[PDB]
Design a binder for this molecule. Structure first.
Ligand code: ZN
Lengths: 248, 149, 60, 258, 78, 115, 31, 146, 99
RNA sequence: GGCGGUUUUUU
């Protein structure tokens, strides 16, 4: 029985694969960053609904997904009121700043509102609560490499102001582009394409997390941002790739 | 000096969960002064040990008395003094974890240093006072000699 | 020894001026449609054309 | 920072095999001497056959193969003859080769057994193992068949071909009682005791010895018939020494040129 | 007003290396000092690293337009 | 059809050198000796002899490929001791040891033969 | 070749900082 | 000897330091040189070499053993403490960098080296070409305070 | 079997294995057991094979799931939980899950 | 300078 099954499988899968390849042997990514067939008919505005190659993608987890409201609040809020904990994490030249300056407090409140919004988006997007998702850069491994390189020593108070992390993440999101163009439609498409990745990036690099679990320094965080942007640009799909034959 | 730690320990239990390998076993030892737990993995073959045995364990950052901080490389052709001359079992590892009971307000009061001697693991749990010379990512030595008492 | 075979512009057929077939007739290996699809996936159009034209049956 | 002082003790000396023990040596040197016994050992053997008429039933190359496998004594001829490759003449000169002739023909009704005895050698000492036990059967001929050929045997070693392999079966054993633990027995009680095991019948294997080096290498060299066993040992030691001497000379020239 | 990606795709890089190696094999003036090599492919790779290949790539778009990039203008991947 | 002959495992070819020396640049006092047309017989013993020598920090032989008749012996001694002389002394002491062993074996055999 | 460009090389200028005071020698006339 | 057609002219940059120039080291000229090859020198190479050698007319020029950077560096870092009020400057020629001249001085309390290039029109310093040879040296003494 | 915790090598074996390493820096690592005799470890020798400063964690096949919850999380009795840091094997045995 | 078919084998 096993031998007969193997023979029929080898006889049918051959014709199946032949048809699958002849159906899409012409599809390819054009220089306009869009998948089209031989008739220039758009099949995907962006390859894989993202515009990224399937080689530089690894499995990761969405930290802000399936949390308990209270757990999420206490973990992604960065309390700027517990002066004892603020001294324990940051340095004295930053605790007084985060206490006095109210602009920083408003910025962190706005960041938490944006974090809550992204969590709701993930919940309405990924029903059933599935944290395992494929994304380009493995931010956890990158943070680990940065720690092991710069010798962070998670124990001493780090020197990284939350405003610095917030502005760095914002600048990094502005840099990573897929749909080049200041047009309203261009910006809308760019945001919709890199939505999940930016959500995951923000969820990983958070003020409270970066100040509690990672303890990265300024130079370490700068190197982390550089590495992330470089890896994302490298994972960008190369125009002129027979995505059709690859999928077949 | 470089003596990151030095203390006498006594053996009280070996491989409580059954001996897994054939040349290595767990040494659940307890201090005598500092009151500290020790979960060391030694080579039972070349350096056999039984229950009730006491050994003077000295975790150091270098084997030289003057303390020159060696770069870290196998150089047997060395006539310099060595602290290993009065120890029977020496191993070179790198502390890979330092857990502690920290909180969000008051500092930690109890630490636990996990070091790996190229395969053999040793956990040294105790107070957060005598474990100041232990830092993550750092080479250390074991240096243990059995006491005749 | 009964299976080893090579080629470097050996004999050509009469109908379609392409290499022969078979080790005895001193023929070349067949570049199957599956190999064509593999090369397409790689994206080596130059190599693909060289295999299906240059080292197959050049003609004007 | 120098070599060691090895000792030797023979336990059995016979005309077919020799058992000895080498003490105060290294495992690498012991294994090297063993491999030299098995391969690099000069010895004579048929190598260049010329058949003029073979009406036997076997093949024409079958005869040459069998003639090459037939041994030939070379107790005091291999040290005198030179390699035909390094010869300074043309054609197999008697100074670097021995000649053999075979001319048989089955006339009677009974089948013939062309054995090694038919190999009439031109030299007196270089002859197949038939001095002092039947002979090596080459082929069988029936009435009306024949075989005429002449062969030349040269000097060679096992590294070239198995015909120049004098040592039939070299048995080499070190540390009978698994003391150094070079072999871990999952169940020592299930393994027998070695022939040279000094351990009693109660204990399965000797205990562990950390500061223990491999010593006391027992060899049992069994000669095929060409060279005597002690002769094989001496020739192997001489060959290994010559290889080391040539390597040292080449190294000195290379150092001087640089 | 060029909108194509500023990186060199692997296909373009491989084709440019092969073409430059062929031009070099046909006896052509190099654009870099040779340290002591004779393989035209290696010379083309060195020229790419030095950013001196006298070639501009004409990338066509689906509409029909085309953008001309320069090996020394766009960033190289590898 | 492509089987190599049987003499290319020991006989030297016109142009090939028996032994070649190459100084390494990664660490001081390190030399690799490439020997052509040899096997483990003429390599394991030299490695063991070099190990016995205390001034040799490192000594190990390898075969780049079984089909290829060639070995590489990397040696590294103290800065006040060169690998060339290390190799020379190793081979010399090994030759002396083999000669002594041969003499002892010969006398043992001549004694065993009715003595 | 072993005789490449020399004058075509772009003379790179170095940068630096030195909040120093003015206390050097004056200037001379061109005559 | 590198290729064909073109020609190489070797001239003296100063006392010891020479320089080669290949004509299309790249030196551009007119096409009439084929009739009187004397012009490539009588109008470019010789005037450029004379401009380069004009430094010999000033006593502030020296050899420094073929323009040893280490010698100038040690001298400059020693004189800073031997005679702070009399810090000298030097102009030398390098043997490992034809067509250039090392102008050694102390911009600040740190070591640094600077070079000046010669051109057909004259010299080149800080990216500006000068038609004369003395104009650049007179402009340096005034604009070296940057 | 080479990356197990009970794997010890002598200087001779270590220096012989180092011969087959095309990316060896040329320096011999400090043995995991200096006295009473220099004994390297299988994991210590394999660390030199990992290029660069790679960081990763993996689980071994015969890894009991009821271990991370209880104690001995970062110190597995069965030598599981491969934790490579700075391109150096520390804990755990290699298998298909890691290679 | 040579063809079509069938069969048998191998991954
Ligand atoms: Zn002869």
């Amino acid at each position: 029985e096993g031998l007969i099954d193997t023979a029929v499988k080898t006889a049918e899968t051959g014709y199946i694969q032949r048809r699958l390849i002849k159906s899409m042997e012409s599809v390819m990514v054009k220089y306009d960053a869009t998948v089209r067939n031989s008739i220039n008919q758009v099949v995907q505005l962006r390859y894989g609904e993202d515009g990224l190659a399937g080689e530089s993608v690894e499995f990761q987890n969405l930290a802000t997904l399936k949390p308990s409201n209270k757990a999420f609040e206490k973990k992604f809020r960065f309390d700027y009121t517990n002066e004892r904990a603020l001294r324990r994490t940051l340095q004295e030249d930053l605790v007084k700043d985060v206490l006095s300056n109210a602009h920083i407090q408003n910025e962190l409140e706005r960041e938490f509102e944006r974090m809550r919004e992204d969590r709701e988006v993930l919940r309405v997007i990924f029903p059933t609560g599935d944290s395992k998702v494929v994304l380009p850069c493995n931010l956890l491994r990158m943070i680990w490499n940065a720690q092991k390189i710069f010798h962070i020593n998670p124990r001493l108070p780090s020197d990284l102001h939350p405003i610095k992390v917030v502005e760095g993440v914002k600048e990094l999101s502005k840099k990573l582009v897929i749909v080049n163009g200041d047009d309203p439609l261009s910006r809308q498409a760019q945001e919709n394409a890199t939505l999940l990745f930016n959500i995951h990036l923000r969820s990983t690099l958070c003020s409270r997390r970066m100040a509690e679990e990672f303890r990265l320094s300024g130079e370490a965080f700068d190197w982390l941002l550089g590495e992330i942007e470089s890896k994302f640009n490298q994972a960008i799909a190369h125009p002129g790739e027979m995505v059709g034959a690859l999928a077949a | 000096a470089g003596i990151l730690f030095e203390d006498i320990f006594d053996v009280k239990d070996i491989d409580p969960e059954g001996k897994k390998f054939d040349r290595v076993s767990r040494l659940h030892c307890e201090s005598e002064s500092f009151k500290m737990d020790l979960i060391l993995d030694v080579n039972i073959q070349i350096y056999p040990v039984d229950l009730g045995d006491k050994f003077r364990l000295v975790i150091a950052s270098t084997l030289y008395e003057d303390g020159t901080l060696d770069d870290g490389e196998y150089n047997p052709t060395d006539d310099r003094p060595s602290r290993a001359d009065q120890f029977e079992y020496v191993m070179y590892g790198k502390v890979y974890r330092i857990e502690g009971d920290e909180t969000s307000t008051e500092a930690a009061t109890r630490l636990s240093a996990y070091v790996s001697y190229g395969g053999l693991l040793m956990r040294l749990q105790g107070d957060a006072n005598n474990l100041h010379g232990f830092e993550v990512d750092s080479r250390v030595y074991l240096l243990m000699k059995k006491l005749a008492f | 020894d009964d299976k080893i075979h090579s080629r470097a512009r050996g004999p050509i057929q009469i109908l379609n001026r392409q290499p022969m077939e078979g080790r005895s007739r001193d023929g070349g290996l067949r570049f199957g449609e599956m190999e064509r699809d593999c090369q397409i996936a790689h994206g080596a159009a130059q190599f693909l054309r060289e295999r299906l034209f240059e080292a197959s049956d050049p003609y004007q | 920072p120098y070599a060691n002082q090895p000792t030797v003790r023979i336990t059995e000396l016979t005309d077919e095999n020799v058992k000895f023990i080498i003490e105060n040596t290294d495992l690498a040197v012991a294994n090297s001497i063993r491999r030299v016994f098995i391969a690099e050992v000069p010895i004579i053997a048929i190598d260049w056959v010329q058949i003029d008429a073979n009406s036997s039933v076997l093949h024409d190359e079958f005869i040459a193969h069998r003639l090459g496998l037939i041994p030939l004594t070379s107790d005091d001829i291999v040290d005198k003859l030179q390699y035909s490759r390094d010869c300074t003449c043309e054609e197999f000169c008697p100074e670097c080769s021995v000649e053999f002739t075979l001319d048989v023909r089955c006339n009677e009704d009974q089948t013939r057994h062309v054995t090694s005895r038919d190999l009439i050698s031109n030299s007196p000492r270089v002859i197949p193992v038939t001095s002092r036990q039947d002979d090596i059967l080459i082929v069988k001929l029936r009435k009306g068949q024949e075989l005429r050929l002449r062969a030349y045997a040269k000097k060679g070693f096992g590294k070239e071909h198995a015909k120049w392999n004098p040592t039939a079966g070299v048995a080499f054993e070190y540390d009978p009682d698994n003391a150094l633990r070079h072999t871990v027995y999952p169940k020592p009680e299930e393994w027998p005791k070695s022939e040279y095991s000094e351990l009693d019948e109660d204990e399965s294997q000797a205990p562990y010895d950390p500061n223990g080096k491999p010593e006391r290498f027992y060899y049992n060299v069994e000669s095929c018939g060409s060279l005597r066993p002690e002769t094989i040992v001496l020739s192997a030691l001489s060959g290994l020494k010559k290889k080391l001497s040539d390597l040292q000379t080449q190294l000195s020239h290379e150092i001087q040129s640089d | 007003k060029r909108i194509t990606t500023p990186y060199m795709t692997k296909y373009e890089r491989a084709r440019v290396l092969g073409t430059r190696a062929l031009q070099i094999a046909m006896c052509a003036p190099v654009m870099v000092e040779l340290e002591g090599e004779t393989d035209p492919l290696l010379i083309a790779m060195k020229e790419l690293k030095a950013r001196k290949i006298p070639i501009i790539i004409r990338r066509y778009l689906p509409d029909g337009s085309y953008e001309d990039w320069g090996v020394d203008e766009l960033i190289i991947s590898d | 059809m492509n089987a190599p002959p049987a003499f290319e495992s020991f006989l030297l070819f016109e142009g090939e050198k028996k032994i070649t020396i190459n100084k390494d640049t990664k660490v001081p006092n390190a030399c690799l000796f490439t020997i052509n047309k040899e096997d483990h017989t003429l390599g394991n013993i030299i490695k063991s002899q070099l190990l016995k020598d205390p001034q040799v920090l490192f000594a190990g032989y390898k075969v780049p490929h079984p089909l290829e008749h060639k070995i590489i012996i990397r040696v590294q001694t103290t800065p006040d001791y060169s690998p060339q002389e290390a190799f020379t002394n190793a081979i010399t002491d090994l030759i002396s040891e083999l000669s002594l062993l041969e003499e002892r074996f010969r006398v043992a055999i001549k004694d065993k033969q009715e003595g | 070749g072993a005789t490449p460009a020399y004058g075509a090389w772009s003379p790179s200028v170095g940068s630096g900082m030195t909040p120093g005071a003015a206390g050097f020698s004056p200037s001379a006339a061109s005559d | 000897s590198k290729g064909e057609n073109h020609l190489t002219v070797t001239w003296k940059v100063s006392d010891g330091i020479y320089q080669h120039v290949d004509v299309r080291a790249t030196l551009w000229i007119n096409s009439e040189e084929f009739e009187d090859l004397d012009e490539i020198v009588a109008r470019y190479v010789q005037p450029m070499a004379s401009f380069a050698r004009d430094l010999l007319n000033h006593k502030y020029y020296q050899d420094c053993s073929g323009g040893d950077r280490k010698k100038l560096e040690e001298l400059l870092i020693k004189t800073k403490k031997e005679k702070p009020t009399f810090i000298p400057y030097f102009i030398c020629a390098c043997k490992e960098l034809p067509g250039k001249f090392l102008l050694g001085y102390q911009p600040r309390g740190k070591p640094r080296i600077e070079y000046v290039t010669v051109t057909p029109e004259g010299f080149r310093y800080r990216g500006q070409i000068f038609p004369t040879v003395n104009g650049l040296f007179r402009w340096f003494k005034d604009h070296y305070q940057d | 079997k080479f990356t197990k915790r009970d794997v010890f090598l002598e200087r001779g074996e270590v220096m012989n294995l180092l011969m087959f390493l095309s990316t060896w820096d040329g320096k011999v690592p400090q043995p995991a057991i200096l006295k009473p005799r220099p004994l390297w470890t299988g994991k210590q020798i394999f660390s030199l094979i990992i290029p660069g400063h790679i960081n990763c964690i993996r689980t071994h096949s015969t890894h009991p799931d009821d271990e991370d919850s209880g104690p001995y999380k970062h110190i597995s009795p069965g030598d599981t939980k491969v934790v490579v840091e700075n391109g150096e094997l520390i804990m755990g045995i290699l298998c298909k899950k890691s290679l």
